[PDB]
Amino acid sequence: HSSGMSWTVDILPEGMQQQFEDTISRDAKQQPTWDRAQAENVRKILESVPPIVVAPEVLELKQKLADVANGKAFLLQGGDCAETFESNTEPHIRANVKTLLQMAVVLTYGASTPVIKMARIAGQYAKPRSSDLDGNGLPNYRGDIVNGVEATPEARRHDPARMIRAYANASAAMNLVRALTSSGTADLYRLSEWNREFVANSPAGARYEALAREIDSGLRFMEACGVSDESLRAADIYCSHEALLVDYERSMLRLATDEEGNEELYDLSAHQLWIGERTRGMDDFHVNFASMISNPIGIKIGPGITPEEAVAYADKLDPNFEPGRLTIVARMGHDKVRSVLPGVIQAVEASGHKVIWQSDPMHGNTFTASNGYKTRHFDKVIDEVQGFFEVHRALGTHPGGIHIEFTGEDVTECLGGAEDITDVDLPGRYESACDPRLNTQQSLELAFLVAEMLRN
Amino acid sequence: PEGMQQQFEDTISRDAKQQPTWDRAQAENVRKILESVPPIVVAPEVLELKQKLADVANGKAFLLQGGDCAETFESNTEPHIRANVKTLLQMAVVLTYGASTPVIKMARIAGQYAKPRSSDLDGNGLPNYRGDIVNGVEATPEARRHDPARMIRAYANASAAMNLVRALTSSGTADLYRLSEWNREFVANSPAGARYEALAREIDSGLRFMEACGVSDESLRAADIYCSHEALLVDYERSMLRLATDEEGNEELYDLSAHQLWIGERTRGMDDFHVNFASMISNPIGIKIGPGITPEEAVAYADKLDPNFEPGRLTIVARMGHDKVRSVLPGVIQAVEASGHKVIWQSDPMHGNTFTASNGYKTRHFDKVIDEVQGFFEVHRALGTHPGGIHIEFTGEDVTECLGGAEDITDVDLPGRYESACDPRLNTQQSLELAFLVAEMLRN
Amino acid sequence: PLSDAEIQKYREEINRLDREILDAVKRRTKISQTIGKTRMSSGGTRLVHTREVAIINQFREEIGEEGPALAGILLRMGRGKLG
Amino acid sequence: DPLSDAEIQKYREEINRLDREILDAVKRRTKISQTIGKTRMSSGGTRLVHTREVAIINQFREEIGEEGPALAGILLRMGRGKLG
Ligand SMILES: O=C(O)[C@@H]1C[C@]2(C(=O)O)C=C[C@@H](O)[C@@H](C2)O1
Ligand SMILES: O=C(O)[C@@H]1C[C@]2(C(=O)O)C=C[C@@H](O)[C@@H](C2)O1
Ligand SMILES: N[C@@H](Cc1c[nH]c2ccccc12)C(=O)O
Ligand SMILES: N[C@@H](Cc1c[nH]c2ccccc12)C(=O)O
Ligand SMILES: [Mn+2]
Ligand SMILES: [Mn+2]
């Protein structure tokens, strides 16, 4: 048959369309309120443009996140709470990229494993808000993809054309991220030089001296052993953001066919996407959208989550039991993390799912100070990661990664650190469009401390 | 053989101390046989070694040299050679981490079969053992006769040893992660493991850091070990001379019985064979200097043994005793550095610190061996010059030859497993300990 | 010689000082651990960064180069290794 | 809140006095070590004695465990200097 049959042969997909109609018809929290005609037309435009990432990149990330999930790698994710178009500039993107690469060197030494580097970037332009308004019946700022920061009626109108502004800014940002990471900014030795200066100039320099020396001897040892710096002159930074805005994420859906012929649906606005605390209703748009796209997925779970719910998300979002497909992002508060997480981890591990366990120590530890500035204390941010680690060592499970909001700018947004920031310091350089970020120094201090947690 | 011939006749026309008295016509037959045999090493290797030794003297590398005080045919076995090779490599990984530079690894092996004796005869008229290339250990008239045929036996044994050394280092014995596991089971098993814990943990974190950075390299699976020995016996050494022609067309004369040859403390007369032979050959050269050396005498050696001012060409090997190294060496260093030679400065903390114990056995105290290298490093740090390397006699077997170390070997312990055919060697434990301490010296 | 007999009674005094350092490190460790339990039982953090840095920096002010390492040990015994 | 505050201020000043004591002990230890070093080296003996260092390190680990060696290490480097 085989030789006969060989010469004879020589002479909108159907399942997806079901799931996609299901998903689009679900309720969607935290949406804008804009003209349906204008919206559709902007999606039509954005359905044809170059995506922000390509599918094989997403397949490579999935392989890396599977290593994380299996105890063989660590996930560092972070950047601005909210990107803005005004701030989406070379110096600022460079400032954050460096900070994250710098943190990653220290964490790699501490984990003794690769660190996967995921920036909050190239699309983090929507934010959840408690009401549609409330100051004076004037619309609340929902991020630069919906409306403007300016506190006026014209600026606060929900504008669908801002989805194109956002795509363009995203594109530019990813272009630069890629360019920097391939042209010398992610050089291991240049980054270690930057860490060495951080230590030398910190008022808490002596807290880090000895780990910093030890890392340094590690680097010099490679070079002594005759290692060519082929692997060491660059690195991959991946983009991520909260999949929030319905109209934008659907307009970036792309079909991708791999090498073994298999057709998949990707949201190619980013490598990785996550579902917020406020939008994770199990019958709602966001969870079901994430369930039908092949991108790796994150989910934010707060201190009210039960183990039963943890498992059901895991079943919804990881139904084919793929290590690292799904990342469970605990943001519980420093005082709740040691109570709540153990039970969550135990039920989920037992259900045969192998997720990445990630600590978001920012969003459970936010408060409003005497002077009315939203802030977070460094000690409480640190204590939640520390407790996260404690839980993992007690259960024998893998502390998968961290998700932190930071910038490479010398801001005064979070209290504490070596610079000893207090209530009165906060209005000096408070620059965030949304939540209080760790500044450059606090970010580096935190990487050294999470390095010590990993070494234990 | 035109410019060279003038210089060779001058070399062989000079007195050589420490030779055997044997029938010269026999020796000459033995030399004609050995002049046709494959060399122990080839010239491209020696050229590679010299580039590496240039890096040492210019302060970008460290020389680790060591092995048996004296090889014997009896002891030239796979287990014994593997043992020393393993220990040398294990030491080298720890020293590499401390130095933050490559370590050039140089074994006393494949030819360390001749030793200098003070009296030719003993008080009862019996000739002394001069090494397995001259006569036997067995103290009889027949076994102590100086036998030139032993030159062939030395060549056959050296070939076999060096063949094995190459096999081991290319087939996994020199793998970096395997060596580090042996270091780890040293630390976990030593009575002084807690002295080394922190440093061992730092190295491992460093190793795992390379792996985490995605360094996949064949560099880490293998390593080069160069052989060396004291160029003592005139007839064996001259019969292993070979002309090698370069990539660019130059004829150089090498003694290819080893990559590196050195001149002993008792054979370094300026007017004598050994110094003048060393001047002639293009192998890298070492020279042992003791406590009686003067800065002027040291500069005269540098002029003669390094006439073309080639960094790394000459290694000056200070063996002064711990009690004298801090007084004698500083002036020697300043004089030679000011004369414009860039030598490798190496410590031999063994031969200046030997003594005979109450029970009759020769021994060395670990603390005095350490204090000399410690002092050597102190002198270098004061002057701002480069500590180039160390030269130590050791074996990878559980011997009781040197006092001290973590196991606190005393006089009483020496008779247990004293096995050296000449000087007292550091056992495995002491060697691995010394590597850690010298790594701290390198770290300061 | 005579100088060996002196060394033996100088070492005798080091030993007594080593007992003192070691006795006090133990005691210190008990107290730091209790502060930990008292802050934690009322919804507080395991670690207090500014207090840690302050001690480390003052140890350096006091003994120099080894100050931070000496303080690091007391900090590790008292609040545990991180993670 | 105010009751757990006040107590921690007392425990801290109590930690401070224990630190004063440890610091003051370390300083006199280090004088004595140096003095032993000078004595031995002025009469043609070695800077370091290995067996002696090993025993202290091993005592320290037997007494406080994990951190034993690192503490003894600090004192030895204070006493006889960094190696090299
Ligand atoms: O709050 C504290 O004062 C205690 C004591 C401690 C120490 O060991 O000195 C100092 C700072 C904190 O990180 C820990 C450890 O709690
Ligand atoms: O011999 C000695 O007793 C002194 C004291 C010392 C120490 O500091 O404890 C212990 C051992 C020696 O190596 C040094 C340092 O000299
Ligand atoms: N070949 C490398 C690494 C290496 C392999 N085995 C070794 C043994 C010792 C020291 C280093 C190594 C080097 O010589 O540097
Ligand atoms: N490419 C390697 C090593 C490396 C290069 N640049 C880096 C920056 C941070 C951390 C590691 C690296 C890795 O990412 O693992
Ligand atoms: Mn935020
Ligand atoms: Mn010898």
Could you please report the per-residue DSSP string of A214-266?
HHHHHHHHHHHTT--TTTTS---EEEEEE---HHHHHHTEEEEE-TT--EEEE
For residue B365, the 8-state DSSP code is: B
Domain assignment present for B432 = yes
Across the interface, which of A206, A379, A454 has its CB nearest the CB of C48? A379
Spatial separation of the C-alpha atoms in residues D80 and C80, rounded to whole Å: 30
Residue D36 tokens, joined: 């032993």
Tell me which residue of D53, D48, D52, D46 sits closest to D73, measured CA to CA.
D53
Identify any residues that bridge with B286 across adjacent strands, giving them in sequence order. Answer: B262, B315
User: What six digits make up the tokens of A107?
Assistant: 């964490």
Give the whole-angstrom CA distance, residue B274 versus residue B16.
Answer: 7
B/C touch flag: 3 or more CB pairs below 8 Å: no
Spatial separation of the C-alpha atoms in residues A298 and A241, rounded to whole Å: 10
How close are the terminal C-alpha atoms of chain D, in Å? 52
Its domain, for residue A175, covers 1-456
Residue showing tokens 């420093």: A334
**CA distance linking residue A337 with residue A383, whole number of Å:** 9
**Does B26 fall in a domain?**
no
In angstroms, the CA A215 to CA A208 distance is: 11
**Does residue A328 contact residue A357 with C-beta atoms inside 8 Å?**
yes
Radius of gyration from C-alpha coordinates of chain B: 21
Contact by Cβ (8 Å): B198, A217: no
Nearest residue to A170 via CA among A126, A235, A115? A126
* Contact between D69 and B368 using a beta-carbon 8 Å cutoff: no
Query: Residue A426 and residue A411: Cα distance in Å, rounded?
Result: 8
Nearest to B180 by CA among B241, B120, B223: B223
Residue identifier of the C-alpha nearest atom 1 of ligand 4: A235
Q: Which of D71, D75, D77, D83 to substitute to test the interface with B, most B CBs within 10 Å? A: D83
The answer to whether B133 and B155 have CB atoms below 8 angstroms apart is no
B356 DSSP β-pair partners: B362
Give the span between the Cα atoms of B127 and B144, in whole angstroms: 6
Q: Ligand 2: distance of its center to the CA of B64 in Å? A: 28
Cα–Cα distance list, B438 to A304, B104, B228, B377 (Å)? 57, 15, 22, 9
- Tokens 């009575």 correspond to what residue? B191
Residues C18 and C69: their CA atoms lie apart, in Å, by 17
Those residues with Cβ within 8 angstroms of residue A81's Cβ, 6 or more apart along the chain or in another chain? A120, A124, A362, A405, A432, A433, A434, A435, A436, A437
State the Cα–Cα distance between residues B23 and B336, nearest whole angstrom: 42
Residues A413 and A271: their CA atoms lie apart, in Å, by: 29
Question: What is the C-alpha to C-alpha distance for residues A271 and A279, in angstroms, rounded to an integer?
Answer: 20
DSSP string for residues in A20-33: HHHHHTS--TT---
Helix axes A188-201, A440-455, angle to 10 degrees: 100
**CA–CA distance, C18 with A63 (Å, rounded to integer):** 54
DSSP letter at B7 equals H
**Cα–Cα distance for residue pair A106/A117, rounded to 1 Å:** 13
Please tell me the distance from the alpha carbon of residue B177 to that of residue B180, in angstroms, as a whole number. Answer: 5
CA distance to A177, B98, B387, per residue, from B62 (Å): 41, 10, 8
Helices (H), A112-245: 162-183, 188-201, 205-224
Q: Using an 8 Å Cβ cutoff, are A436 and A372 in contact?
A: no
Q: How far is the CA of B396 from the centre of ligand 3 (A)?
A: 19
Q: What are phi and psi of B387, to 5 degrees?
A: -70, 115
Annotated resolution, angstroms: 2.2
Torsional sign, CA B16, B20, B26, B27:
negative
Contact A333, A384 (CB under 8 A): yes
CB contact at 8 A, A343 and A350:
no
CB A294 within 8 A of CB A266: yes
* Dihedral over Cα of B265, B268, B273, B276: its sign: positive
* Amino acid present at C54: A
Q: Which domains does chain D have, with CATH numbers?
A: 1-84 (1.20.59.10)
Query: Number of C-alpha atoms within 13 angstroms, CB side, residue A436?
Result: 28
- Take residue A273 and report the two structure tokens written for it: 């996407």
Within a domain: residue B55?
A: yes
- The DSSP bridge pattern shows strands A326-330 and A297-301 to be parallel
Radius of gyration of chain C (CA): 17
- C1 in contact with A, Cβ within 8 Å: no
CA distances, A21 to each of A15, A25, A48 (Å): 10, 6, 21
Per the DSSP assignment, residues forming a β-bridge with B251 are B245
How far apart, in Å, are the Cα atoms of B30 and each of B23, B50, B130, B131, B236? 11, 30, 18, 17, 9
- The residue of chain D nearest to residue B442, with distances taken between CA atoms, is D84
Q: Which ligand is nearest to the CA of B180?
A: 3
Whether A264 and A256 have beta carbons less than 8 Å apart is answered as yes
Q: State how far the Cα of B145 lies from the Cα of B147, in Å rounded to an integer.
A: 6
For CA atoms A240, A242, A243, A247, give the dihedral sign: negative
The answer to whether A238 and A269 have CB atoms below 8 angstroms apart is: no
Residue of B nearest to A105 (CA): B213
Of A209, A383, A416, the CB nearest to C68: A209
CA distances for A239 relative to A57, A123, B298, angstroms = 11, 8, 65
Q: What is the DSSP letter of A130?
A: S
* Overall number of domains in chain B: 1
The residues lining ligand 4, judged by C-beta closer than 6 Å to any ligand atom, are: A 101, 104-105, 108, 114-115, 186, 188, 191, 231-232, 235; B 213-214
For a mutational test of ligand 3's pocket, the pick from B49, B55, B90, B93, i.e. the residue with the most ligand atoms closer than 8 A to its C-beta, is B93
CA distance D15 to B9: 81
Give the other-Cβ count within 10 Å of A249's Cβ.
Answer: 23
- Cβ contact B304:B297 at 8 Å: no
| B182 located within any domain | no
- Residue C75: both structure tokens together: 């900090």
B60 is in an annotated binding site: no
- The rounded distance, in Å, linking the Cα atoms of A236 and B222 is 30
Q: If DSSP states are collapsed to H, E and C, what string results for B105-168?
A: EEEECCCCCCCCCCCCECCCCCECCCCCCCCCCCCCCCCCCCCCCHHHHHHHHHHHHHHHHHHH
Question: Which residues, at least 6 apart from B396, have a Cβ–Cβ distance to it below 8 Å?
Answer: B82, B83, B84, B85, B86, B87, B428, B431
What is the DSSP code (8-state) at residue B386? P
User: What is the atom index within ligand 2 of the atom nearest the CA of D29?
Assistant: 8
C8: CB partners within 8 A, 6+ apart: none
Distance CA A234, CA A178 (A): 10
Say which DSSP state A44 is in: H
Selecting from C6, C17, C28 the residue whose C-beta is nearest the C-beta of D15 gives C28
Instruction: Count the Cβ atoms, other than its own, within 10 Å of residue B106.
Output: 29
Q: Is residue B217 part of a domain?
A: no
Q: Which residue, chain included where needed, has tokens 């004037």?
A: A138
Q: Is B261 helix (H, G, I), strand (E, B) or coil?
A: strand
Interface test with A, best of B209, B211, B218 (most A CBs within 10 A): B209
- Specify the DSSP class assigned to residue A325: S
Residues B226-257: b if buried by 16+ CB within 10 A, e if exposed: bbbbbbbbbbbbbbbbeebeeeeeeebbbbbb
Asked whether B368 and B340 are in contact (CB, 8 A), the reply is no
Give the Cα separation of B336 and A242 in Å (integer): 69
Asked if B205 lies within 8 A of A108 by C-beta distance, the reply is: no
- A with B: how many residue pairs have Cβ under 8 Å apart? 72
